[PDB]
Design a protein around this ligand. Structure first.
Ligand SMILES: CCCCCCCC/C=C\CCCCCCCC(=O)O[C@H](COC(=O)CCCCCCCCCCCCCCC)COP(=O)(O)O
Ligand SMILES: [Cl-]
Ligand code: NI
Ligand code: NI
Length: 289
């Protein structure tokens, strides 16, 4: 199967020069020997080979110390159904460019009930296990469905009713911790973010959070008030957008859009193409031979 994957000659050179540096210092596990993973790290440090190597070796040590390589089999997150009741979030369909759409209903987060049913450390380990599923299953499924290389998501954060007066220091610190793990270990995986239903109460929440965010991440974020539905329908087809966000989707047979995990990673023919299929990238295939 032929997937649209344009490589720039200048990027092909830089990534191979980075790969040769990693091999010569035994910093390249075969699991991470992928043109596109290395390209994301190089982009995160503006193709500075020395800063990217330091970022890379920090990530290798992090995967070792965290237990990231074995998290699917090791981490049984038994409180998942209770957590999801007090923090509604999920992937739901694809945007018009084939990227997965990730939604969080932050207006419906119950922080007190959430700390009754999990811990911050367990929630973060669940975040890492879901990220591993996103980069190994969900993004490659989107590559197949669109016949195009995809490795980043469109995020919608619904912040209805969220105001600065109820924006707590533990809420801030979780955002910091989640972003630190994402920026260190999953770089360049956010394409864009739409923050919707922001009230006048939200202006100081966004002010204070931007002080802690990677400034490249800030440039990918759009904060919208109550009139958001047409902006989401411009970039996401109505069939892929839940009806509560202005689309047609109800996922009624699966108990609703925030629980269905709807997307091409649920299709058995696409998942067979991942397990059976030869590499999604021609440069990896040519390095192998
Ligand atoms: C009602 C209680 C507080 C509600 C939440 C506060 C409002 C948050 C406002 C702004 C957040 C802006 C963050 C921008 C950076 C996120 C970048 C990003 O890509 O992350 C995406 C998801 O977005 C986030 O990570 C957003 C941050 C999540 C955390 C939100 C805070 C939850 C608060 C719970 C409090 C628990 C502790 C309470 C103890 C009493 C996923 O990436 P991808 O699409 O690539 O898979
Ligand atoms: Cl589906
Ligand atoms: Ni749905
Ligand atoms: Ni490629």
């Amino acid at each position: 199967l032929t997937i649209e994957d344009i490589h720039d000659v200048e990027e092909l050179r830089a990534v191979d020069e980075f790969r040769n540096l990693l091999v010569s210092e035994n910093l390249l596990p075969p699991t991470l020997d992928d043109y596109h993973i290395m390209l994301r790290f190089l982009k995160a440090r503006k193709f500075d080979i020395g800063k990217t190597k330091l970022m890379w070796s920090n990530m290798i040590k992090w995967r070792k110390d965290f237990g990231t390589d074995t998290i699917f089999e090791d981490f049984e997150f038994e409180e998942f159904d209770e957590v999801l009741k007090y923090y509604p979030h999920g992937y739901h369909g694809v945007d018009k460019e084939g990227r997965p759409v990730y939604i969080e209903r932050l207006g419906l987060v119950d922080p007190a009930k959430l700390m009754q049913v999990t811990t911050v450390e367990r929630f973060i380990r669940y975040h890492v296990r879901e990220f591993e599923k996103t980069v190994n299953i969900k993004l490659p499924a989107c590559c197949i469905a669109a016949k195009r290389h995809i490795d980043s998501s469109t995020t919608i954060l619904d912040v209805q009713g969220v105001g600065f007066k109820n924006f707590s220091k533990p809420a801030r610190d979780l955002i910091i911790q989640l972003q630190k793990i994402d920026n260190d270990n999953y770089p360049e995986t956010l394409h864009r973010m739409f923050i919707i239903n922001g009230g006048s109460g939200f202006k100081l929440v966004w002010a204070t959070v931007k002080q802690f965010l990677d400034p490249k991440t800030v440039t990918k974020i759009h904060v919208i008030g109550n009139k958001y539905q047409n902006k989401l329908l411009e970039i996401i087809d109505a069939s892929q957008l839940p009806d509560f966000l202005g689309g047609t989707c109800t996922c009624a047979d699966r108990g609703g859009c925030m629980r269905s995990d709807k997307g091409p990673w649920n299709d058995p023919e696409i998942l067979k193409m991942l397990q059976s299929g030869g590499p999604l990238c021609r440069h990896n295939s040519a390095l192998n031979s």
